[PDB]
Design a protein around this ligand. Structure first.
Ligand SMILES: [Ca+2]
Ligand SMILES: [Cl-]
Length: 399
């Protein structure tokens, strides 16, 4: 079968559980589309509830920050008339506002601004849909695909620069607060039976180094790359290339969302994380099989310094096998970061800078996650992960 008709293999990760991931492989020819701009993409997707099996070929670069005439949109097009960045910053400055949640005129104007952008950049992917890039240069620039539905395949696309013109200030987030943006390249928001394969994820022509600091914190225009929340389940992400980005992959959005318990069943294999700062993945609650992934970076880079790979969040059940981390100088313990409620990590065959480590034991964790993955393809020895992943992960390594 050609790319548009390929499905997830019957043993290939949590995505293959139960009914599996067939996407739009059963489509008739009247639901096979080739799209090259936002309008064509939106028309082909139809409404949230268009469950008819469909295949969507992306040809060229689809910029999502565009009006209905495909004219480019920026800050001043999206801005609410009351919003003014200068005024937002003077309102919420910790030396006059303190650490209370922003409220009043500029936060309200900011929220409405963000909604205006969201209506353009965020697109929902309905059930039984395969979206695949044609050739080696299929790109989505500015867009956030949201998948709330079952049975979706996304492959062979370079996603770039899911950029938010209206980051929110949150002074309660850590000890000096943070800026947060809304847009991922892909957000699996309660979606199920999803395969994300041979995609590339990066920050395009607007890396975080071109963002200023406000209140001493990076004015962050980006959020995740491939995130999962709100009971998302049964997902395989394979052979993708994440690079030159801060927050990569967050699975479970809140310690209060204990309905994520027994869900967030996700398999990550043969992905490349190069110059990724953090969260690769950060997990709450999920049974997440992480195997044969390659992580490379520098703790002293000036653009995207490595901080950690795996975030051991509340009641997380990461089962990690034969993953390879090349970050010179990094202490074994600091391959991971443990958050409140994070108590367990199983990891075997972890290589850090050529040396076999036990990340779980280096942090005093339990290695009992209470499950063992049965559904996986063959597991590579750790010694071959770097080559297989460098040579095979990412968009345009099929067409
Ligand atoms: Ca996100
Ligand atoms: Cl988080």
């Amino acid at each position: 079968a050609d790319l548009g008709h390929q499905t997830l293999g019957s043993n290939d990760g949590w995505g293959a559980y139960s009914t599996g991931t067939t996407g739009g492989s059963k489509a008739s020819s009247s639901n096979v589309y080739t799209v090259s701009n936002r309008n064509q993409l939106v028309s082909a997707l139809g409404k949230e509830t268009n469950t008819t099996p469909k295949i969507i070929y992306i040809k060229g670069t689809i910029d999502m920050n565009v009006d209905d005439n495909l004219k480019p949109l920026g800050l001043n097009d999206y801005k609410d008339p009351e919003y003014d960045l200068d005024k937002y910053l003077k309102a919420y400055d910790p030396s006059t506002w303190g650490k209370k949640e922003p409220s009043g005129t500029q936060e309200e104007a900011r929220a409405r601004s963000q909604k205006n952008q969201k209506a353009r950049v965020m697109v929902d992917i309905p059930a039984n849909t395969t979206i695949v890039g044609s050739g080696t240069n299929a790109k989505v620039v500015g867009g956030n695909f949201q998948i709330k539905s079952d049975n979706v395949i996304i492959r062979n696309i370079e996603f770039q620069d899911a950029y938010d013109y209206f980051p929110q200030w949150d002074p309660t987030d850590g000890s000096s607060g943070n800026w947060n943006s809304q847009y991922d390249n892909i957000t699996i928001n309660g979606g199920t039976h999803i395969w994300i394969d041979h995609c590339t994820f990066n920050d395009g022509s607007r890396p975080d180094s071109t963002s200023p600091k406000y209140y001493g914190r990076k004015y962050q225009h980006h959020d995740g790359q491939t995130d999962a929340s709100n009971g998302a389940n049964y997902i395989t992400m394979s052979y993708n290339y994440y690079h030159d980005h801060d927050k990569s992959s967050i699975f479970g959005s809140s310690d209060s969302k204990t309905s994520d318990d027994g869900k967030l069943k996700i398999t990550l294999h043969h992905n490349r994380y190069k110059n990724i700062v953090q969260r690769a993945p950060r997990v709450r609650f999920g049974q997440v099989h992480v195997y044969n992934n390659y992580y490379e970076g520098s703790t002293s880079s000036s653009s995207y310094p490595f901080s950690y790979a795996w975030g051991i969040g509340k009641s997380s059940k990461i089962y990690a096998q034969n993953n390879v981390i090349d970050v010179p100088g990094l202490s074994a313990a600091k391959t991971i970061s443990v958050f409140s409620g994070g108590t367990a990590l199983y990891d075997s065959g972890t290589l850090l800078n050529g040396t076999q480590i036990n990340a779980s034991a280096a942090n005093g964790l339990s290695s009992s996650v209470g499950w063992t993955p049965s559904l996986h393809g063959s597991i590579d020895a750790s010694a071959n992960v770097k080559s297989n992943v460098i040579n095979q992960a990412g968009a345009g390594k099929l067409n």
